[PDB]
Amino acid sequence: MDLVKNHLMYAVREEVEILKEQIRELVEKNSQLERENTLLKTLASPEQLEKFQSRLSPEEPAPETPEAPEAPGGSAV
Amino acid sequence: MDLVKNHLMYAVREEVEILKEQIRELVEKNSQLERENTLLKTLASPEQLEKFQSRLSPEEPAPETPEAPEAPGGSAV
C-alpha cells in the first residue's frame, strides 16, 4: 500500500487522531484568531475608541500608578 | 515536509516532542493571539465586560443562577 502513507494531509494517521485534530483546530483557531485579531487591530487602528493617545486625543497621563512615593526599600540601591 | 522521516536514523525525530512542540507553539501563538485579541477587543470594544469590576476578563458566562428577589438582575437597570 502506498496511499495510506500519502494522504496524511487527510489525517496523517500514524500519531494520534486527537492530537492531529488538536493541531488542526489549533491552527484553525489560531488562523481564525489571527484574522479576528487583525480585524480588531485594523478596526481599532484608525478611529474606534474614545480618544486617549496622541493621534486622537492626548490624555491618560502616566501608566496605572498613584501620585505618591510609597515603595519599600530603605537602601536597596 | 516528508523530510523528518528521512534522517530519523540520525536521531529518530518524530517522538512525542514534535507533537508537544507543535501543540506548545500552537498554544503559545494562540495564547499570544488571545492576550492581544482580548486586549484589542477590550480596547476597541470596552463594552463587553462591565459585567464585573472593569479590568480583568471580558466573558465569564453564567448558567441558571439565582438572582435577587426584586425585579432587576442584582446590579443593573
Side-chain angles (χ1 to χ4, degrees):
Chain A
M1 25 72 232
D2 214 341
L3 56 109
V4 192
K5 255 104 88 270
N6 251 96
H7 65 174
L8 283 47
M9 275 201 293
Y10 99 138
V12 70
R13 72 208 258 158
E14 212 237 280
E15 290 242 28
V16 214
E17 288 92 46
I18 307 173
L19 239 66
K20 168 249 115 127
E21 235 126 35
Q22 238 198 301
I23 269 45
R24 225 270 282 188
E25 246 70 48
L26 246 294
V27 176
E28 196 93 294
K29 280 265 171 239
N30 180 294
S31 222
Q32 214 167 61
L33 248 81
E34 220 232 334
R35 203 252 244 176
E36 252 195 296
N37 175 70
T38 294
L39 197 86
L40 283 189
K41 216 231 308 309
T42 26
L43 259 61
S45 228
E47 264 165 302
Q48 214 108 325
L49 290 136
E50 41 160 289
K51 329 305 138 189
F52 22 84
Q53 265 143 204
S54 283
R55 28 161 63 108
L56 350 85
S57 175
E59 256 157 10
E60 264 54 30
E64 174 226 276
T65 169
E67 278 194 287
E70 198 235 13
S75 204
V77 291
Chain B
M1 47 143 66
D2 309 314
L3 164 128
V4 316
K5 214 169 148 53
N6 256 75
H7 42 203
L8 22 50
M9 220 290 271
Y10 79 153
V12 92
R13 215 149 147 94
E14 193 91 9
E15 294 196 24
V16 191
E17 266 150 282
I18 60 146
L19 246 180
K20 253 247 295 194
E21 215 96 306
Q22 247 86 286
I23 180 169
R24 173 173 267 224
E25 203 194 81
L26 262 52
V27 171
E28 178 194 12
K29 248 112 179 189
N30 190 233
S31 194
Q32 186 80 238
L33 234 303
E34 216 115 62
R35 183 255 253 294
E36 171 137 292
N37 185 356
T38 300
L39 218 143
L40 244 51
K41 201 188 184 74
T42 292
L43 234 130
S45 284
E47 275 221 304
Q48 210 64 226
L49 155 154
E50 309 213 278
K51 182 185 40 275
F52 51 60
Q53 292 104 159
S54 40
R55 43 94 94 278
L56 31 164
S57 150
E59 170 113 273
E60 336 193 344
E64 197 108 275
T65 88
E67 317 171 85
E70 263 208 296
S75 256
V77 109

